[PDB]
Amino acid sequence: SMVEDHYEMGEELGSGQFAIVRKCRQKGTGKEYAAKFIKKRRLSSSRRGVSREEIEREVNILREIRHPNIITLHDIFENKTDVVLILELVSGGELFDFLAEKESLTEDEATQFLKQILDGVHYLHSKRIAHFDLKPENIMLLDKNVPNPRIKLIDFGIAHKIEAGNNIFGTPEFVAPEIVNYEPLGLEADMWSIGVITYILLSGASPFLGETKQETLTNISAVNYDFDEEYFSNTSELAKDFIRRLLVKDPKRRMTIAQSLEHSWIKAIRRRNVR
Amino acid sequence: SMVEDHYEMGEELGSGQFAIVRKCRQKGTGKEYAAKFIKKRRLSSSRRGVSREEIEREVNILREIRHPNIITLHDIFENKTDVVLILELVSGGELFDFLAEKESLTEDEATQFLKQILDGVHYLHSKRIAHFDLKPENIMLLDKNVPNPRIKLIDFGIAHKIEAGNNIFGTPEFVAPEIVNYEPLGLEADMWSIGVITYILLSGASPFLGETKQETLTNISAVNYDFDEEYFSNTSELAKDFIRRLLVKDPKRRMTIAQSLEHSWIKAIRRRNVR
Numbered sequence A, B: 001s002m003v004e005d006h007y008e009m010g011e012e013l014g015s016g017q018f019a020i021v022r023k024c025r026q027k028g029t030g031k032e033y034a035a036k037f038i039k040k041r042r043l044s045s046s047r048r049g050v051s052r053e054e055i056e057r058e059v060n061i062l063r064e065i066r067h068p069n070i071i072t073l074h075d076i077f078e079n080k081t082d083v084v085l086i087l088e089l090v091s092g093g094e095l096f097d098f099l100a101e102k103e104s105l106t107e108d109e110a111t112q113f114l115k116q117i118l119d120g121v122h123y124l125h126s127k128r129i130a131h132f133d134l135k136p137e138n139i140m141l142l143d144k145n146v147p148n149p150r151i152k153l154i155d156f157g158i159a160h161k162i163e164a165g166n167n168i169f170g171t172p173e174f175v176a177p178e179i180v181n182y183e184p185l186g187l188e189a190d191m192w193s194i195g196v197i198t199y200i201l202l203s204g205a206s207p208f209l210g211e212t213k214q215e216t217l218t219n220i221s222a223v224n225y226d227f228d229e230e231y232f233s234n235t236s237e238l239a240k241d242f243i244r245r246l247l248v249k250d251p252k253r254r255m256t257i258a259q260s261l262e263h264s265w266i267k268a269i270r271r272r273n274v275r
Ligand SMILES: CC[C@H](CO)Nc1ccc2ncc(-c3ccc(C(=O)O)cc3)n2n1
Pocket: A013, A014, A015, A021, A033, A034, A036, A071, A087, A088, A089, A090, A091, A093, A094, A137, A140, A154, A155, A156
């Protein structure tokens, strides 16, 4: 009767700051799922756990989205301490793991993954949803032991709907400079992330990584990276152009998801990879 | 039975881009109110009218707030085209009108208004509410024909709750520069506005106003203003210090509402003004 009682919880799959993922089994069907336990914030004024509004944001996004390259939400329940998302079980690991094993990917291998990531982001962007945390750890594989693995985007923990929005009619005389210069975060941030994913897939090298977290942030802000000959000596001009057109400081000058899909590097006719 | 049928609408009081305000009378009590008609957006995808979410934001803020220097929401209804806010009727005009008649205010007159504005903003900020459109047009007087008029803050059309908020736990390696450098809009914007209000109350001069809207925006961003001797030759150093400590580009370096209330110019013992 209680939805919680319909799932038998099993072992931990992993953990983050705010959530623990456990394997589970639906009692009646025997089908397995991933159960993401999100620890609820206890008082509005607390700085721990996740607020009701932040949980609802993620769950509302997961409920709206349906695409082959995006994780599926199967069910949801809540108890005293947690809201539990019952998600499709995906058993081929993360793209992070796959890349770590291969060291780097060829351009044909990289584009087979990227086409899928681009399709999934195209879908999200069509619904005005910015994921805001695209990275290889948030891209799962259905089965890693095939030559062209299928992927699923996960972790909508900081995903947002982007409104079209700006008193544009009133006097600006009393408005603060941060408002005068306000530019909302939007879909372009995902495009930047896709450029970084592309770079790392081709090289195994992180383009902005510094010796300290502060150095990484400084490098990102300055767009301080290059195509080091250690990794890119034989990389195509088209692959470099794709990355350059995404790694742009000004969000308004980055390729859009539509432009990325029409880029020659992605359009290019290639063979599906053999084992 | 229908709430709408309990109010007899009268003449227009004023109009903006998105709203018309009419005088009205509650049929049973005979008491008069201001009725703000907010035109509803017709499709999510439309760029006209006001979205449900934007209406709810304003109405939820008005419902939470109760303070002598803040407008009171009395009732609400909705019809096919509009959501109608029934507000306390305030008949002494705007601070905008009052200043236009006086040309400029003395420091004693200015501080009598400012103490009230500061009290009202103190309250809003205590509830994590940024008004975001403070200006003399959004400050009404109960009665303009007294020496020390009482005021009410109005127009919560772009007011927002400010959360305390920032994947601070994950890698920043894939994060876009606009996210790395993201600073949310917050309570400091109101403090800037209060500095501009103060300046104009003392001089009748707008500090950043240019010949074109673009010039005004450029002046705001650059904090390009001075204390022109035409208006400020006899203004106190304390009044200038108060304004300087608010008109600061970096929001994090502006006086907070608590600091403003403890400033010597505001703390100073003064006589209530005579007629
Ligand atoms: C921390 C959990 C890690 C993720 O790679 N392990 C697994 C293992 C199998 C599996 N199957 C589905 C999922 C999963 C799917 C989605 C999320 C999410 O949207 O945050 C999290 C986990 N996961 N996660």
